[PDB]
Amino acid sequence: KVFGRCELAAAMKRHGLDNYRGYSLGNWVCAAKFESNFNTQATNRNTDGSTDYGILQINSRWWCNDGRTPGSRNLCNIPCSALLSSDITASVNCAKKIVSDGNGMNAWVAWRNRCKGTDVQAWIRGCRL
Report the interface residues with Cl ion, using CB under 5 A: 5, 11, 24, 26, 65, 69, 72-74, 79, 87-88, 104, 120-121
Residues known to be catalytic: 35, 52
* DSSP code per residue over 42-89: -EEE-TTS-EEETTTTEETTTT-B-S-STT---TT-SBGGGGGSSSTH
40 sits near Na ion (criterion: CB under 5 A): no
The only residue of 36, 59, 60, 91 in contact with Na ion, by rule CB under 5 A:
60
Binding mask 70-109 for Na ion (x = CB under 5 A): --x-x-----------------------------------
18 is in an annotated binding site: no
Listed residue (36, 25, 14, 6) closest to 121, CA to CA: 25
